[PDB]
Subunit: 144 residues, 3 copies
């Protein structure tokens, strides 16, 4: 079945909201609000240890936010890759830029893969994975 | 108040029209058509001198277009941040690239903030501000 | 006199076709998926960024057989989508591209440019009948792995 335009834009907006929360370099609560409590936050596709649940996502961003100075996550090329009414999936391209407090830059040219579920507070992410389109530029050490 | 999809897309289109006008590196009338007659064009958030009104905005671009050779303003991550019916607010990320006639490059990784009004000729910008997501690469001297 | 307004469903369908084209290019392999974007008769004319024009599926297939043979990685980011024309069963759309690649020879390329798609409604949906490009910034790298 076809994804309603309303839901396509909602899911895009969730992803853009996640980018905004990361790009604060501070607002963990805003990051967590994107995800269900049980969410799989699995960035093993770019070489980072998987995390599950809000506690794991919090740990991840406590570290990232402590280590990073500036961030910008540009999301483009949104495509609905599945829709089953109460659940959906969406792909986007990312230009994920950062500079650490240690001065070291990073740019990821890759893809975000979101799985989402319709909840009483809107669409939320149940699973998030990634991969590369280009070889990593710089370092992911400040996210480890 | 939720912004209708038709208006959301119209406001995005306006912002993309602005980027197109800037990227002509010549069409000041097209730039001015984005803006209300009394619009605030305030780029102080990226270090430039603010202007108010079409005369000011024309001055700003007479200089920029005199000094620049090539422009590209990629806009992404659009988000409605306010909607009051006849007024609205939208955020976008920009990758703002330029090369001067003097050969000096600039890239702004930042954000646009548009405030818009519904007019007899469609949505138009009443205020435009910016800030950075990453430290400025290159120079904004060709826009001063 | 207002031109005929492009319906939202069609605007999104045409955007999606262009994003599908980028996806196909970014497989660095799937010529069939690339060709699915175009009418059999399509004009594939990238002379605006310095490449030789092609016409039809045969020509597009030749083009990508070469590109895919020479390239290691691709990323084609498309942004600033704008409907530039709509006549009902035909339309046109502009997009900005950040077209990135690295060759098997290790040479990088980045195109900062624009895509211009002219599309037609078919029984299998909107398809591209003409595709052209130009630059917003001076080419970074070579398009020799696309030549």
């Amino acid at each position: 079945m076809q994804c309603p335009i309303e839901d396509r834009l909602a899911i895009q907006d969730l992803m853009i909201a996640y980018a905004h929360a990361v790009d604060t370099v501070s607002d963990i609560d805003a990051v967590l609000d994107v995800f269900t409590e049980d969410a799989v936050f699995d960035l093993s596709g770019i070489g980072l240890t998987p995390q599950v649940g809000h506690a794991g996502i919090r740990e991840f961003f406590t570290n990232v936010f402590a280590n990073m100075s500036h961030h910008a996550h540009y999301l483009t090329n949104f495509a609905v890759t599945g829709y089953e009414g109460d659940t959906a999936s969406m792909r986007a391209y990312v230009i994920g830029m950062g500079v650490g407090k240690d001065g070291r830059a990073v740019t990821v040219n890759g893809r975000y893969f979101f799985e989402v579920r319709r909840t009483e507070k809107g669409w939320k992410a149940t699973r998030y994975t990634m991969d590369f389109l280009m070889p990593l530029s710089g370092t992911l050490d400040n996210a480890k």
